[PDB]
Amino acid sequence: EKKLSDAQVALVAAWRKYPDLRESLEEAASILSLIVFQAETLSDQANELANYIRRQGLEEAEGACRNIDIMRAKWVEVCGEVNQYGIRVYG
Amino acid sequence: EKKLSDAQVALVAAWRKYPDLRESLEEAASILSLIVFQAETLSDQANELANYIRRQGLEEAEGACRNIDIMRAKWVEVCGEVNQYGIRVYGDAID
């Protein structure tokens, strides 16, 4: 039941309490954001490749395509999703 | 520039200095770790999709395979690569 937002809360809470931690934990926060962004870029790319494969009727890769769907749903549980207003929302 | 290990080390450094942060920041560290694990699991699946495409000779989607290679390379720049002994290694220490 752990979420991306939980980690983000903890990081800012930490250096607001202890300002000497600002430089290192804002950096960690930026690295976490970078990681999430890169992951979601590759995930979308994988999803679109999987969609293409399905449309081509290539049943040999059907297990793989199904795995991409399962993994994408699991990701949204932890990291939510960004809507059209640029807000990251959770279930 | 700055790597996954930098973030990892920063979390630990912080609660070693301020023990009262250990609960919140250990949790954060485990979330970071989970996110990296799920990303890398999906990445490996994406890589095998591309492998399948290329084995079939399906050139229509070759651009997607090149895209996946580029993104995996960029990921490894930041997050390194876990070797067969489960050690995450970076840069020229890979392969």
Author numbering:
A (entry chain C): 2 to 92
B (entry chain A): 2 to 96
Which sentences did the original study use to describe this structure?
One mechanism by which phages and other mobile genetic elements are able to overcome the CRISPR-Cas system is through the expression of anti-CRISPR proteins. We previously reported that gene 34 from Pseudomonas phage JBD5, which encodes the protein AcrE1, shows anti-CRISPR activity against the type I-E system of P. aeruginosa strain SMC4386 (4). We show that AcrE1 binds to the CRISPR-associated helicase/nuclease Cas3 and that the C-terminal region of the anti-CRISPR protein is important for its inhibitory activity. In summary, these experiments demonstrate that AcrE1 functions by blocking the activity of Cas3 without inhibiting the DNA-binding activity of Cascade.
(c) Structural overlay of the X-ray crystal structures of the AcrE1 proteins with an N-terminal (blue) and C-terminal (red) 6×His tag reveals virtually identical structures. Thus, the unusual nature of the C-terminal sheet was not a result of the presence of the 6×His affinity purification tag fused to the C terminus. The C-terminal β-sheet region is unusual because both sides of the sheet are exposed to solvent, contrasting with typical β-sheets, which pack a hydrophobic surface on one side against helices or other sheets. We also examined the packing of the C-terminal β-sheet within the crystal and observed no contacts that stabilize it in this position. Residues 82 to 90 form an antiparallel β-sheet that protrudes at a 90° angle from the end of helix 3. This sheet structure appears to be stabilized by multiple interactions between residues at the base of the sheet and residues in helices 1, 2, and 3. A salt bridge is formed between E41 and R89.
